[PDB]
Design a protein around this ligand. Sequence first.
Ligand SMILES: Cc1cc2nc3c(=O)[nH]c(=O)nc-3n(C[C@H](O)[C@H](O)[C@H](O)COP(=O)(O)OP(=O)(O)OC[C@H]3O[C@@H](n4cnc5c(N)ncnc54)[C@H](O)[C@@H]3O)c2cc1C
Ligand SMILES: Cc1cc2nc3c(=O)[nH]c(=O)nc-3n(C[C@H](O)[C@H](O)[C@H](O)COP(=O)(O)OP(=O)(O)OC[C@H]3O[C@@H](n4cnc5c(N)ncnc54)[C@H](O)[C@@H]3O)c2cc1C
Ligand SMILES: NC(=O)c1cc(N2CC2)c([N+](=O)[O-])cc1[N+](=O)[O-]
Ligand SMILES: NC(=O)c1cc(N2CC2)c([N+](=O)[O-])cc1[N+](=O)[O-]
Ligand SMILES: [Zn+2]
Ligand SMILES: [Zn+2]
Lengths: 227, 229
Amino acid sequence: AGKKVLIVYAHQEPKSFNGSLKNVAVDELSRQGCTVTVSDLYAMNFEPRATDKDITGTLSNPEVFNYGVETHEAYKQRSLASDITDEQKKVREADLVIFQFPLYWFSVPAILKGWMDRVLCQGFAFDIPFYDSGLLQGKLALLSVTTGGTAEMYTKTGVNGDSRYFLWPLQHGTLHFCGFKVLAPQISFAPEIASEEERKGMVAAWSQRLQTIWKEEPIPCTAHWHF
Amino acid sequence: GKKVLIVYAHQEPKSFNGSLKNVAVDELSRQGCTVTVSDLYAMNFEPRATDKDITGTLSNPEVFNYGVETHEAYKQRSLASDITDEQKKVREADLVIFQFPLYWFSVPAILKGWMDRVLCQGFAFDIPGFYDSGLLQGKLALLSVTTGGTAEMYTKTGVNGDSRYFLWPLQHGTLHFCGFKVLAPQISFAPEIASEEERKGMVAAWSQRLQTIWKEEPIPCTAHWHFGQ
Ligand SMILES: Cc1cc2nc3c(=O)[nH]c(=O)nc-3n(C[C@H](O)[C@H](O)[C@H](O)COP(=O)(O)OP(=O)(O)OC[C@H]3O[C@@H](n4cnc5c(N)ncnc54)[C@H](O)[C@@H]3O)c2cc1C
Ligand SMILES: Cc1cc2nc3c(=O)[nH]c(=O)nc-3n(C[C@H](O)[C@H](O)[C@H](O)COP(=O)(O)OP(=O)(O)OC[C@H]3O[C@@H](n4cnc5c(N)ncnc54)[C@H](O)[C@@H]3O)c2cc1C
Ligand SMILES: NC(=O)c1cc(N2CC2)c([N+](=O)[O-])cc1[N+](=O)[O-]
Ligand SMILES: NC(=O)c1cc(N2CC2)c([N+](=O)[O-])cc1[N+](=O)[O-]
Ligand SMILES: [Zn+2]
Ligand SMILES: [Zn+2]
């Protein structure tokens, strides 16, 4: 009872296939009785750049600027920019964080990379001394990604290599590092090339999966699993 | 008459990344290379991929698709001038160096947005016309990366796994995809942790390698190189 879900959504176009996957997730989780929140990064015009503007008032060291150190101190002293702290409050509350994005250069769009860079700061998401000691432990995360390339292109012997290869920085380097349990990713291959029956199939496979995500076991987020 | 582009992503000129950038400029300049630096934070480079990147009529205003609309805008010469400025720098370069701190096992978002917006279809690749037939064929690229984690942490049985694991999306998914020959990356491990002499050692090791980069062969940018299966 009482689950909270955050969808971090990174697509420019509401009528896009990513938009449809986002809306189906909202409708399905909402129908289940979940509390749902969406961060529509493009709609918020989310700032992706990691700068000194992220710290309100005086800097820890004005002579030489170190983003990691200065955000860590600002977090502790409650003087991070309000857009960062609004996102952190959403993450703190969520039991599950879904990231919904098109694959850009085997990775996340820059706007979503900037959300990770700015929101997941030391003191909040991890400290030194991460992974299993990571501060977001107990939370689930699940990447829902769309690609331009077909499934066949993303195999061990295909041009792009296994899709698990590009997931490692996101799943292990980021999500696991912060203490998340990672659910198996949802990959919708090459929707722009797909038939309208296929696109419907992939959208329904997504909603079908959402009906039972609370029963899913996390993946073993290991080198072995990805490689 | 070699031309070099450094795409540089650090907020602070006094940083370790700034030092590596400066010795690259100094050393390449001393050899007689033509050198350009794109200092992204200093340019306040726009990382977001939006419809502002296209001037003039969208091909399909009703449903906006960034890849389609930028491809068409490239061909029509209606991309925003900050994108076209960077493309002219890439077009002219024999060697592109990326210099950046590792952020979440990847590039900082500002540099990610440079890749997302500069390397568009028609310019960097076509469908078909990618990997070994990518449009930037004949050009060299080199990642010069700094990390918070030490070398021990970035081994096969280290906490982070091998450093080559995180290089795949950049080296293969992006640089090789666009037709670049990729040189072996320069990784400067954990400079904030290092001693004064070890930081100097790492700077001098970069300088020293640059003296001879024109003699280097590219790596085999393969799954086996990155992953050893
Ligand atoms: C900078 C950049 C870098 C990229 N790098 C990579 C990369 O490294 N690797 C890779 O594989 N790809 C890459 N791509 C391709 C990219 O991942 C795809 O273009 C994207 O995933 C397609 O998803 P979409 O939401 O944008 O689809 P859309 O084009 O918006 O939708 C596909 C079709 O589905 C339709 N649709 C919408 N909703 C529904 C619904 N309810 N039911 C049925 N149909 C519907 C739409 O009308 C549309 O025709 C890159 C693209 C860009 C722009
Ligand atoms: C959002 C974020 C995400 C991150 N994710 C990762 C990650 O996934 N993995 C990881 O390993 N790390 C990660 N880090 C750490 C990051 O990679 C390091 O902080 C960065 O690489 C350190 O490089 P720097 O240039 O900033 O060093 P600096 O902060 O500048 O410090 C290095 C020292 O070298 C000194 N120095 C400068 N020039 C010279 C010179 N000429 N000779 C001798 N000494 C000199 C400086 O004064 C300084 O004391 C992350 C950091 C942030 C903020
Ligand atoms: N269709 C594809 O296979 C494709 C398409 C694009 N662009 C056209 C959308 C990109 N990409 O931009 O990196 C990459 C791939 N890819 O398989 O690595
Ligand atoms: N020093 C490290 O070990 C380190 C430090 C940082 N931050 C403090 C600079 C990050 N990181 O930001 O995810 C990651 C790692 N890491 O090895 O995966
Ligand atoms: Zn892991
Ligand atoms: Zn390759």
